[PDB]
C-alpha cells in the first residue's frame, strides 16, 4: 500500500541524510513531488522484509553488494538510463549495479579501504607491506606501534590476502562462477601467512577490534591504520594531522581491497518509478546534488565523472579512488555469505594458532563453495540422477521407460518368463511393436540391449556413489556387473540374434505426384566406399540423403570418411502424373561378402527398373575391390499402377539400419491396389555384432551433414562465419526459436568458393518476421536466390541454380523497408548431378535386308505389291530394357519384333495406321533380335505397303 505522487527514500544513518533531504526540498520546490528521507536502523535487513509484501520506500540507498540478493527476489526495478546519461558516470560503477545483464540501481559513491598514517611521526608512508616488520622495531623502541587495524572482520584483512592473487569468485563474462573459489590458492596463502607472521612477531595483536584500532591511531599510539572515508569524521575532531594514501603493496603486487559502490535502487513495487528516475538522474546525480550530500557527510569518491574531478583535488578522495581501482569490485551474489564466514573464521583460526594457514584456507574453500555440490559423492550423485532422468526421457517418446526398468529388474533376479529368458520375452515385444520403424529386427533389438545395459551401468554406478555419500564401506560392483553383462551378451548372441531379421524398409509413405518424362538417377559411392544409409524426406521438395563411407574390419564404418551426398528429383521418378507407371520388382540379394556400391535407376517410357552393383569386400583389409563386382537388376516381374489422378504415395522416412552399416540387398515393391511403393534393404549388422563385442556404431544423422552454410544452426559457441554489418544486428539473440539462439535484425556469411557453377542447390531456413534473404554476388551483383518481402517461425524450402558468378557470393539476411526479422537454421545443399537418359536410334538405313521386291527411298520403306516384300533389320538390344517402336504405315502390313524363340511385339495393320507408338521390353534375351516389315497377306504377292518414319529407341 504505497502512495502515489510522493517519494520516500531510505538511506543509512552513517550517510549524509540531511544533505539528501535538502536535495529533496529542491525537488519538491521545482516539481511539487514530496521527498522524505528516512534513516532507519537495520536498514539492510528491514528493506527485504517490507519490500517482499509490496510496501516499503521508493528509493533504497545501500552498497551494491546487497542489491544482487534484492534483484534475486525481484525487489529492485530495472532502471533505464539512456546512453547519454550512462557516459556521465564511470563505466566500472555501472558494472557493480548490473545483475544478469540488467541495471538495478544508480551508482552514487565509491568507497574503499585506504592506508591512514600520522604525518607527525611518519612524513612518508611505507610503500610496501614488507617494510612494516622492519620499521616496527625502530618505532617500538620509541614506545609506539606501526600498524593497527581491525583484524576481526575479513573485509579489512582481505586486501593483504588477495594481493598475490586471492579472489572470492572468478569473474568471467559478467557472471560470478560459484564453483571457482580462490581462497586456497598460493596467493591467498602467502597473504595470510604474512599477516600471521606479523602477529607472531608481536607487530600486531590478533585481538584488535575496530574500537581498539581507531583509538590507538587517533591518540598517536600507533603509526598506521586501515579504514574508509567514514572514519575521517572522527579523526578530524581529534585534529591529529592525518593523511590518506595508497595501501601498501605485497609481493610486488598491490593490495586488492573490496570496493563498495553506494547505489540507489528503485523499488519494483513503487508506483513512482518515473518520479524516482527524475529525482536521481536530474537532481541527485549532478554537481549540485552530490555536493549537497557531500557537505553533510563526506561521500568519498563518487560515480559521477563531473563531481569526481572536483573531489580528486582532495588527496584523501584521490587515494580512495586509487585504492578502489587497484582492488576488486565486491561480488553482489548472495553466495558471499558463505565466503565471509569462511574467510572470517580462517583468519581468526590462523591468527589464534588454532589452525595453520594451510588448514584454515583448505576448509575455508570448502565452506565458501558449500552452496554448491562439493566435488565427489555430493556432486556425482546429482549428476547421476540427472543423467538417469535423461535416459528416462529417451525411451518415453511414444513402449516406455518403466518397461526397461521392469525388464532390467527381471534380468538381475534371474526371473525367467515363458520358459525363455526375460531378455527373450522383452525382445519378442520389440519385434511386435517396432514393425513400422526405421531399422531391422537386429538393429531394433540390439538398440534395446544398449539402453538396457546403459541403465544397468548407471544403476550400479548410482549404488556405488550412494554408498560413498552415506559413509558406507566401499564395495566393488565391477565383477558382478560384468558377470551380468556377459550373461546378457551370451543370451542375445546364441538365443536372440539368429532368429532376428536383418531387412529394413522405409517407415512412412507420402502421397506425391511426380513426372511422366524419362529420368535417370544413379546412386554411386566413391571408389573404395560403400552405400551405408538412405533417408527420403518430402517437405515441398523431395530430397534423398545417401550415406557412404570407407569400411574397417568386420563391416565397421570409417567415421573419418563418412560422406553425405544429396540427390534431387526423387519424386520425379517412382511417381507418374496423370498416367500409369510400371514398376519392375525383384529383391536383389548378394552373397555374404559383397557390399552395394551403386544403385542405377532407369525410368523409360513409364517403366521403372533398377540395376544394383556390389563390389567384393574383404573382412581382413579395409579394401573394397574396384574390379570384383556383381551386378543384378529388377529383371522381369512387374507391377502396374493405374493413372489415379490423386497420386501414388511415394516412400518416405529413413531407409537405414538403426546403426549405419553396409547393405547386401535391395528391392522395390509396388502394390497395385494400395499404390504403396516400398524400398527394402538387407543389413550387415548381425555379421558385425557376431564378430565384435567390444558404441563404435554410427547412428544415421538427423540433420544434413555437408551443409554448405557453416554455423547454419546458431546454437554453438560464438565461433561463426556470420558477419554483422556494424549496425543493430544483435550478435546472438538467446531466447529465439524453441528457446535457442536466432539471428535478429543484417547478418551475412561468405560461402563463395564452396559453391559450384551452374549446379542445382537446395536452400532451407526457418525464419519469422519480414526477412529479405539474398544469395547475391557482392562483386557483379548476380542474385542466385532471393526471398524478398514475405509475411510472418516457418521453414521455407526452395530449390535454385547458380550461374558462373561465385567468387563473391554471400548469404545475406536483412530486413525489408525497415522492420525486424528472425532467422534460424540456414541450410544450403549441393544436389549431385543427374544425367539425361540417352535413348539412341536403333534403326539405320544401311542395316536393312531385303527379300522380294522392296525399295528404300529415304524415310519411306516400300513393300511392292507383286513381290512379297519383307524388310529385316537387326536390333542391338540389352538384357532388361524398355524400348518403343514408332512408324506410320499405309498398306496392309505386319510389323513384328522377334528372336529365334521369343517375340517382343507383333501386330497386323489391315488399314492405314498413322503415328504408331508401341512400347516393348526385353527379358534376359538380347541377341539376334530383329524388326520384320512385311505385308499383312501375300495373296497375289501381297498388297503394296509404305512404311513411314520407322524408328526404334
Residue numbers in the entry: 21 to 418, 421 to 716, 721 to 771, 776 to 822, 825 to 985
What does the paper say about this structure?
Through the addition of an N-terminal MBP (Maltose Bind Protein) tag, we were able to isolate crystals with improved diffraction. The final structure of Vip3Aa11200–end was refined to a 3.2 Å resolution with R and Rfree values of 0.1980 and 0.2389, respectively. Then the protoxin can be divided into five domains, starting from N-terminus: domain I, 1–198; domain II, 199–327; domain III, 328–518; domain IV, 537–667; and domain V, 679–789 in Vip3Aa11. However, domains III/IV and IV/V are connected by long and flexible loops, which indicates that the relative locations and orientations of these two domains could change under different biological circumstances. In our work, the C-terminal fragment of Vip3Aa alone has shown no toxicity through cytotoxicity assays and insect bioassays, and it forms a dimer in the crystal structure, which is consistent with the fact that the C-terminal fragment of Vip3B2160 will form a dimer instead of a tetramer without the N-terminal 21-kDa segment.
Compared with known Cry toxins, Vip3A toxins share no sequence homology, bind to different receptors, and lack cross-resistance, therefore they are considered as ideal options to complement and expand the use of Bt in crop protection and resistance management. The ~88kDa Vip3A protoxin could be digested by insect midgut juices into two fragments: a ~20 kDa fragment corresponding to the N-terminal 198 amino acids, and a ~65 kDa fragment corresponding to the C-terminal fragment of Vip3A protein, which is regarded as an essential step for its activation and toxicity.
